[PDB]
Amino acid sequence: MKITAARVIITCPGRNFVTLKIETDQGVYGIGDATLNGRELSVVAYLQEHVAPCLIGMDPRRIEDIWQYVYRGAYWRRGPVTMRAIAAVDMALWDIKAKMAGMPLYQLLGGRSRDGIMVYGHANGSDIAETVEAVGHYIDMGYKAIRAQTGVPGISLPSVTGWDTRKALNYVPKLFEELRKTYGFDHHLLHDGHHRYTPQEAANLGKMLEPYQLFWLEDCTPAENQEAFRLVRQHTVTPLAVGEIFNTIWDAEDLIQNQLIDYIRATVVGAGGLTHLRRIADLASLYQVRTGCHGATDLSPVTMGCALHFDTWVPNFGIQEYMRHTEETDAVFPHDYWFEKGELFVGETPGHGVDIDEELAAKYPYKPAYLPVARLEDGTMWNW
Amino acid sequence: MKITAARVIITCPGRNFVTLKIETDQGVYGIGDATLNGRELSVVAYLQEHVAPCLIGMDPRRIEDIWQYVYRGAYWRRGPVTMRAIAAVDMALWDIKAKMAGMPLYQLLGGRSRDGIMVYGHANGSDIAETVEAVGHYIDMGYKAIRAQTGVPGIASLPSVTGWDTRKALNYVPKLFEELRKTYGFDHHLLHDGHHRYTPQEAANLGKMLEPYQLFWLEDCTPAENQEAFRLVRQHTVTPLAVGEIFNTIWDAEDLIQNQLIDYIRATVVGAGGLTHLRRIADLASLYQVRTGCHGATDLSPVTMGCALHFDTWVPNFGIQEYMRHTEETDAVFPHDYWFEKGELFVGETPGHGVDIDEELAAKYPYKPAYLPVARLEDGTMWNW
Ligand SMILES: O=C(O)[C@@H](O)[C@@H](O)[C@H](O)[C@H](O)CO
Ligand SMILES: O=C(O)[C@@H](O)[C@@H](O)[C@H](O)[C@H](O)CO
Ligand SMILES: [Mg+2]
Ligand SMILES: [Mg+2]
């Protein structure tokens, strides 16, 4: 058996999405997500100009060998661009293998460990009053868990957002106090610090959030230096989550082994496919750390398909982030998974259950779009 | 003052090179290297399609701000492609800054700490005898330091596949160095590149066997994604350790340095985010007496070498600089102010990093796909080349 083509397909039905389709001399084919929000074309070139030509002629059934080949062979290892390409390949290969085996992907990983996949919604508001109402809305819809984010009163090319930590420190804890007073403690409440705090400030925020029993406080402080979470972990029992921007297990080995986090957010597209995410989930499992896969809209339905198959099997499953795609996106990427009363469900279609309608995809041309950047009040470049 | 253009130039005068040229509304312009061997076009896209557009209109004098902007603004941080793009931008801006100051770059970093820059050459051979001969040649050319690599007897359009067997290497390599010292004595720095082929225990074993031959260093003995991998090596041998040519940020070497597991950090100006970031890596290293030993193979353009030599000229904890000669064509395409003489490199007094690019001449050498090799164990196992 041989790979006869590895094509990259770009479409923009609501936002940019890059897909890889691996074709074989047998007919069966597979697709993988390679979308890197804000730097999409870098992965396209990585795949088309470099990886693709090497895949031709290889035996697609050798998922592990090809993963190692693309990972080690690159010589310059790890990285956002590099791992996205590897993930796209890995996803396409597992898709092919599941199809050939005639089973939905989760069966190959080890079968299902659960039925539905708990997810959390995005309750946003310009202020507390508005955010509180938004959480009520997600509660009405059947969500067992809701992430609450609020604007802080007083706070194409990349947009520029402002930030001031002291204002956030004084406001955010009031949001959650109001949420608990209003809705009680029967719901999982989450918060994304979005890399804005130093370890000490994160420790301060976490301790102030303790009486509100949050499901987790995410990406509280930049994690390039994994020891950064030590101070936070030492000063608070608020659950900690991190990892959406991670691309390999090395970005989290110390956070996990030193028990500095409760949820690992790495995704199938961000951390090199099922092959590598599995290793990350395994290490986490040893320390009772659970999966809490990132799932914003900049991850295509292909990723969500693969993520749900993963979530259906993984023992130490924690939760799955869920952001709805547009109708156009859903048309370009027909899939076998659906939402129902706060839970996602993966179908029984062989492969990861997702496909790409190339003809329809061609009707939505690439359109550049950047993620925002943040600056402090004095103009200092900060973390968005 | 504003950036009016940030163009990417591709040329292949002997091998592929990617260059970024930042222009301003003041006449002065700067260039930086963005070459990532075997994956060149991904950096071209990263820069061309995403970063360049954002640079238009920014104040080129704000080197730190722009570095932080591209580094943090990317959201998805670190990585070989990401850092190569950032390094190119940084090099071009420091180049512009030094030109505007009317001084060669090293003056801005803090002035020269030395005259010449010691380099080491590449003595290779298919077997010990041939390799011993090559070392003698390099010694004849006046090299004070020589890296000696030998093929082991029992062991470009697309990735070539090379074979590997650790046991055979372990039995053969120590004999190379034993022969070298017996033939040339100990009045020469001798270096060896393990090139990621060994596990930590095997590297400890190799290092220990090499101890009698006093090596200047044993480089990249074992994969370092897990910085703890050098702990076993360091605890079992006194042979000096070097690592880092494939690193792209200070976070790839933080623990290696602070836990004193290495003696030389090999990170480069193009691999680790430019002068701005490499300086931070050098500063951390000096606190533990770790010295610089910047990688410098041919896949790094003269723009990188120029920047590296300015950095080497200033940095106090300088150790050594790798030097692989570029082809005449490459030297013609990239006019530069630095030269070699009796085992040392010297950077010139030309304002900026002293390097430039002849765009008209560069256009005469079309890009040509070329990959690095891959290695597989005897049983077919994908390994580290
Ligand atoms: O946790 C989250 O949902 C956010 O961090 C993401 O929306 C993130 O900002 C985007 O995925 C970046 O592309
Ligand atoms: O230390 C060295 O000289 C080698 O490791 C390099 O030639 C390396 O193989 C290449 O620079 C990779 O592009
Ligand atoms: Mg987040
Ligand atoms: Mg090397």
A241 vs A239: CA distance, rounded Å: 7
How many other CB atoms are found less than 10 A from the CB of residue B254? Answer: 17
Fold designation for B105-349: TIM Barrel (3.20.20)
B347 and B104 Cβ atoms separated by less than 8 Å: yes
The yes-or-no answer to whether B1-104+350-385 and B105-349 have a common fold is no
Q: Which two tokens stand for residue B242?
A: 């070097």
CA distance A77 to chain B (A): 7
Which experimental technique did the depositors report for determining this structure?
A: X-ray
> Which residues of A are marked as active site?
194
Could you tell me which chain A residue has the CA closest to the CA of B367?
Answer: A49
B91 vs B106: CA distance, rounded Å: 13
- Rounded to whole angstroms, what are the CA distances from A348 to A102, A108, A305, A312, A345? 10, 12, 11, 12, 10
Give me the amino acid identity at B173: V
Experimental structure resolution, Å:
2.2
B355 and B334 Cβ atoms separated by less than 8 Å: yes
Do A224 and B249 make contact, defined as CB atoms within 8 angstroms?
yes
A28 vs A43: CA distance, rounded Å: 24
Residue A290, class by beta-carbon neighbours within 10 Å (0-12 exposed, 13-18 middle, 19+ buried)?
buried
How would you classify the pairing of strands B338-341 and B344-347? antiparallel
A246 vs B251: CA distance, rounded Å: 13
CA distance A274 to chain B (A): 19
May I ask the CATH architecture of the domain A1-104+349-384?
2-Layer Sandwich (3.30)
How many other CB atoms are found less than 10 A from the CB of residue A309? Answer: 30
B89 vs B30: CA distance, rounded Å: 9
Do A76 and B158 make contact, defined as CB atoms within 8 angstroms?
no
Could you say which of 3.30.540.10, 3.30.420.40, 3.20.20.120, 3.30.365.10 is the CATH number of the domain covering A105-348?
A: 3.20.20.120
Contacts by B70-73, CB closer than 8 A, 24 or more apart: B71/B273, B72/A373, B72/A381, B72/A382, B72/A383, B72/A384, B73/A158, B73/A371, B73/A373, B73/A381, B73/A384
Give me the amino acid identity at A132: V
B327 vs B329: CA distance, rounded Å: 5
Fold designation for B1-104+350-385: Enolase-like; domain 1 (3.30.390)
Q: Scanning the structure block, which residue is given the tokens 């998974």?
A: A337
Residue A78, class by beta-carbon neighbours within 10 Å (0-12 exposed, 13-18 middle, 19+ buried)?
buried
B195 part of the active site: yes
Buried b vs exposed e over B3-39: b needs ≥16 C-beta within 10 Å?
Answer: beebebbbbbbebbbbbbbbbbeeebbbbbbbbbbbb
For chain B, the domains span 1-104+350-385, 105-349
B215 vs B208: CA distance, rounded Å: 11
* Residue whose CA is at the smallest distance from ligand 2 atom 2: B297
Q: Point out the residue among B49, B226, B372 whose CB comes nearest to the CB of A41.
A: B49
Pocket test for ligand 2, best of B162, B220, B295 (most atoms within 8 A of CB): B295
User: Which of chain B's residues have a Cβ under 8 Å away from the Cβ of A74?
Assistant: 38-39, 80
B56 and B66 Cβ atoms separated by less than 8 Å: no
